[PDB]
Amino acid sequence: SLPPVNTDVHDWVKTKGAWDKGYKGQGKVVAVIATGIDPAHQSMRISDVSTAKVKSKEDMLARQKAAGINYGSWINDKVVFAHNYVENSDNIKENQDTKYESHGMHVTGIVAGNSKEAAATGERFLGIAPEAQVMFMRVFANDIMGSAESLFIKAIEDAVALGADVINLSLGTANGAQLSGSKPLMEAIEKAKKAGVSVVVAAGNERVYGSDHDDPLATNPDYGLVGSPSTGRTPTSVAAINSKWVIQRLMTVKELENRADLNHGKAIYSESVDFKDIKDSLGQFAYVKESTDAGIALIERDPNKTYDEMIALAKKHGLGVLIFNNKPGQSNRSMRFISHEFGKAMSQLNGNGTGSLEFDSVVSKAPSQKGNEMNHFSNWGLTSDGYLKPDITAPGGDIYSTYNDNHYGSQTGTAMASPQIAGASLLVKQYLEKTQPNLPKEKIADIVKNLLMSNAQIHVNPETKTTTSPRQQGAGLLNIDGAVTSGLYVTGKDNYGSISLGNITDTMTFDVTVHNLSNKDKTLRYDTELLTDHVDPQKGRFTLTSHSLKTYQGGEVTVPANGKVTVRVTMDVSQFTKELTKQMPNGYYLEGFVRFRDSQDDQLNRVNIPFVGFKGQFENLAVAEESIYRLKSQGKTGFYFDESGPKDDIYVGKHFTGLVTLGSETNVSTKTISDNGLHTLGTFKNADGKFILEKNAQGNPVLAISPNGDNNQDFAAFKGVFLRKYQGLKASVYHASDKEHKNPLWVSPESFKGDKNFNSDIRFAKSTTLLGTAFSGKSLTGAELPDGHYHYVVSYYPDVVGAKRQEMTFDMILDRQKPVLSQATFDPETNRFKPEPLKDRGLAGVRKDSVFYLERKDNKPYTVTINDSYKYVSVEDNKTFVERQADGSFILPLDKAKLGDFYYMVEDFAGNVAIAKLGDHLPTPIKLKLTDGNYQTKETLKDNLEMTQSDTGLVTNQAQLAVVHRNQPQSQLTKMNQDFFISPNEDGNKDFVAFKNNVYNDLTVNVYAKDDHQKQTPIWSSQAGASVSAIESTAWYGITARGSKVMPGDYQYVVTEHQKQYTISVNDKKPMITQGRFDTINGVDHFTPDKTLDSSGIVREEVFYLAKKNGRKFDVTEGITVSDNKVYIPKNPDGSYTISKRDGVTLSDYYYLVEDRAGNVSFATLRDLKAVGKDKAVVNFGLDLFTYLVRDADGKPIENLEYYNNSGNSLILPYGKYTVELLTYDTNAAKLESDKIVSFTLSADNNFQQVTFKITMLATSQITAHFDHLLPEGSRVSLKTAQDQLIPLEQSLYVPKAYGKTVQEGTYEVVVSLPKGYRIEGNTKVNTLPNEVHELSLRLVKVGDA
Ligand SMILES: [Ca+2]
Ligand SMILES: [Ca+2]
Ligand SMILES: [Ca+2]
């Protein structure tokens, strides 16, 4: 009578086994944290509310009051609680086939669907736990805060507090660590486990390292991408397998209805990125078979001719393009007029004649072409710190579940596999509460997981016929019946359902424990299967399939009733070492399963445990791919490097480990107003515009910089292809002579951490540039390091405790000296210009010499290029080069230009350019003197000041900041006799403080913080040779000696029997523009801005409109300067500005500009300020060094939010008393210092309120205690906090002598308690630094009583 239950998944995962025992999920609650839900769906129902946890709306209201939750609502007997956490509302339904799509709804159907009504297959669809209640937390990623981790934490805490049994979380970041995830998220998950809550999370959908590019290289075995928080020990990580059955629109051939091997005449068909089958049919067609692709079309796929040329041929001959595969048994290809592909076997019988064809509109069941195969995108292990994740597998590919408005659809992902496990966890919890009632809250989540893992069914790849890797499937495929029928689970030393062995040498030895929850003894027979990765011998890449090595018999073991037994598994793996070390030279995985079964019958008591070890040193595998310079000299190739283009082309957008720098062209006719962007260090532009890694006379490349301020090769920064997650990355400089790298001359002020360049899709980068590692040729004290041979060293660590520090050394030259131009000969007979043989002044060496003249185009020797897309202006010399002859001479074309109009240019490998204009020394070869015309030089700031007695002597820069154009505006020097405030942002306006009929000697400029009254320690000081003539030597740009920007605040700038002290405030906070007022007098509009110490004071106001010219809001004029098309409006005597109508100017074209005392500029559209009514007020909320709720005078939250000047943190409100409550903020990166609740009153007198939440920023560090020898049995290592708390440290998995943790920045002490007879020698104290790794080397010293 009632429709049949679809069992496509249920027969596979064995759900009936628990359902028959009475475990359907009644009395349980599942919290689904997802995108959206339709709580009205026919599936969202329970059979009996008498046995349910939340019996009514009143029961939930009581739960809310007791939990302190004054939001969210009960919806029905199934959806007992819902809230939208992003928007803070009860708008829980999404997307209000694509029309009804809802990820969250799909997910909810899988765990707890309970439809009474039949879907399109004629079957009703049920979830794993159909009688369970649902809690729905609507949380998702948004532009304002991408992670939304803080909202997911609050949702987790709510679910636990309101009474959930299981939580299904889709949140995730690839390559998760087990022991170093975010502190508030890991704490929230740990409080859930303590409450008896199972936390179920998808593994992710990124496959392995390089999945969007190619298979990983056999030399790079750390390719795991399993995501965080699933990589946490507490959550259950879920991998996905493809369903054996698919429900979709198929293709029917009624004559082939008698073929049960061909799904009774129904076929699966595929299309490319563009779908055009709608234009062909909806819901009969005669087809015709073709044998040749030469002169509906039924055709066999051709390996020679493309899909395009097969389709085109069918159009020319006459209906449709039904392409059938040439490979038997193969799934349909992605093909990338109407066309579609389908199976070979299906068309071997379609091919036999001519007849019927019909594309069905309604979905139908079909066996999957890729069924019982691990999903291609399912995330593999290991964990970034080397633990075995994921934990288990469940069907996630082609899952048919609930969509909006009683609809249904198919979706693929670990996100569909996750609710299978969430549902199963509800049934196992219900089973343990009945059968093990004394098992406490705090222990139940670990046992639910252990039963599901041990009773899981081990997958065998149906193609290779080999056991799927534990790193891909985990413990195996979900078996619900086994987890509720057997009373058995398997554990290792750690008390977990899987074993992570650490490093392997010649032997694998581990202890396996079987637990019996039943009243009778069980005799099990066991064997262990050993596997490794299969490598393609032709490509030297991992195939991501396994190789079975050996099966070891273990014999029989008896597991006592209500008890446990422990066995030892020993395996000598040395016999395989030679063969496998050849294939995988940097080490390889040794993994598999210990399989237990009943000694009497094969079918009963099938329980198992996955294990994984690494043969080698997992902790010391390369973090960064070898440099492009080193790869090129060995003839090797990088994983992501594009080898196309000319020989040795290293275009900077390519993906490699190397050094980058900024280029700036040298012009001869005008000044350079723009740089050329970044380029690869050691590469130079050829005649075709391509950057080539050029060689010196010795055939080696040269890495050299010229830090002289001309913006051409001034610095060198690290760029890397990261193979593994890294931490504590920094750059350091040494003398080339300092081979041991003992005396650092300069260290990057900051340290870095980040992800491996996994490149799962186009959004994930294949390489990372770290501009923070830039070396500009200055020491730690900011002194100029002299020209010479240095070593630029990039050091970093893997995310594995005990790993050795890794480093990449680059030989680098500092050379600030232009090459030598002296003499040349010129032969009037042949026009031969012969310069003196090439010589460089410095160590870099001359790379190229050239000759050019200036081509006059449009009566100018230069070209002004206007890039409207970036609103940028470029100016370039029209350089026309003369060919260099084999003997190094040049034949000057005198018809093109006169002898005196030729330039001779010499450039070194460091970026130093010498240019001589032939003709500066002009009135058979005639001798000709050459000198550089100083064309390449550091720009100099306009100094047209005269210092009078009244002046303080303090100088600064001034520049008009742009609204439209992106060119660096003209800046000039100005006096600072008032408003001693600076904005160190290098925009040309008040960026620094400097000192200018007198004479000064021993000039000494020093800067000290506010409280340094005794002048004890300067933060910055001037460099040896400071003069009143050169303002650069005394200019302080709001930085430390190490080059870091000083924090906002006041400072002592003191010039030195004379000592001139001056207090300078630093602030780059943009001014906050208020709405002002608008009035219409005699038809003409009027704008009256609001009248305004602390650097927020306004020094100048502007009102203007941007007059559009030549399709742009900016103009370029020949001095060459770039300007905005600003038409100014004068201030009226009362204080207003007349916004008089102009023939083509609107209010959105008008602006109000303000400059503060610090030189920070803000501007706003007049139409934006006008959006606030004459009666309304504005409030702004911010953090100073998130989600908020505003309530009216009554206490009712505000509705119909009105946003001011395009800010989601600025609200337009009527007058009245209000309250603001800070609800969430990232507790991981920030700490709140002020009140969460703020009262503010908006009125006519106070029509603009600023409300700030004072926050302190948080940083992390890594501490590792590394010992001499292994610590004796009984030793405890912990870290002592400044607040007297002890953090227990555990022996690292890969480095047993090391103990470490990722901690918040602060002071710590390594505490060690040893048995009698030992002492620890060495420092235990550490003052940790941001993103830094602190290694503590300690000695275990034997001791005796005196
Ligand atoms: Ca330079
Ligand atoms: Ca040089
Ligand atoms: Ca500035």
Numbering used by the authors: 118 to 213, 273 to 459, 465 to 476, 486 to 508, 510 to 527, 539 to 1125, 1131 to 1203, 1207 to 1266, ...
What does the paper say about this structure?
The domain architecture of the SpyCEP(D151A, S617A) mutant matches that observed in the published SpyCEP structures, as expected, with nine distinct folded domains (D1–D9). Furthermore, three tightly bound calcium ions present within the interfacial regions of D4–D7 also appear to stabilise the overall architecture of SpyCEP. However, electron density was only observed for residues 116–1574 of the ectodomain (MW ~160 kDa) in all SpyCEP crystal structures, with residues 34–115 and 1575–1613 remaining uncharacterized. This region is completely disordered in SpyCEP (H279A, S617A) as native contacts between the catalytic H279 and Q613 at the base of the ß-hairpin are removed by mutation of the histidine to alanine. In light of this, refinement of our SpyCEP structure by using the PA domain and the rest of the protein as separate search models for molecular replacement gave significant improvements in electron density maps over using the whole SpyCEP structure, and a shift in its relative position was observed compared to the published structures. In molecular dynamics the greatest mobility is observed for the PA domain.
The S. pyogenes Cell Envelope Proteinase (SpyCEP) is a highly conserved surface-exposed serine protease that cleaves and inactivates all ELR+ chemokines (containing the N-terminal glutamate leucine arginine motif), notably CXCL8, mediating evasion of immune system clearance strategies and systemic dissemination. SpyCEP is a 180 kDa heterodimer made of two non-covalently linked polypeptides derived from the full-length protein by an intramolecular autocatalytic processing event. The N- and C-terminal fragments are 30 and 150 kDa respectively, and both contribute residues to the catalytic triad (D151 from the N-terminal fragment, H279 and S617 from the C-terminal fragment).
